Amino acid sequence: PTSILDIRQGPKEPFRDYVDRFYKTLRAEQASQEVKAWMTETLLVQNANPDCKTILKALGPGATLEEMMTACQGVGGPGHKA
Amino acid sequence: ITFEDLLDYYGP
Numbered sequence: 001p002t003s004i005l006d007i008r009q010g011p012k013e014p015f016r017d018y019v020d021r022f023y024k025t026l027r028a029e030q031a032s033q034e035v036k037a038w039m040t041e042t043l044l045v046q047n048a049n050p051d052c053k054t055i056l057k058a059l060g061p062g063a064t065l066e067e068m069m070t071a072c073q074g075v076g077g078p079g080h081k082a
Numbered sequence: 083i084t085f086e087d088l089l090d091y092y093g094p
Contacts, residue, residue, distance in 0.1 A: 020092070023088045023092055026088070033085065037086070040083055041084060044083065063083070065088070066091075
């Protein structure tokens, strides 16, 4: 049994992959909807990797998920075969 | 962002 607290972005993991894992685990978490909102508002940025965390903090709390994805595109990457 | 934002993004 996993916990949302256990979900952290990998050192080179694409932000898009991490958000998907965060979402899947949060859906299964046993907590109120109000708490799930708070977990998303705080833990998603807090448990991002250092390079994405910097970017997300700069964007600020008004940013949309789509905007966060665009800002973190290619961080850790670009993940093409050599 | 909120949990509802994740639901919208990956859902309905």
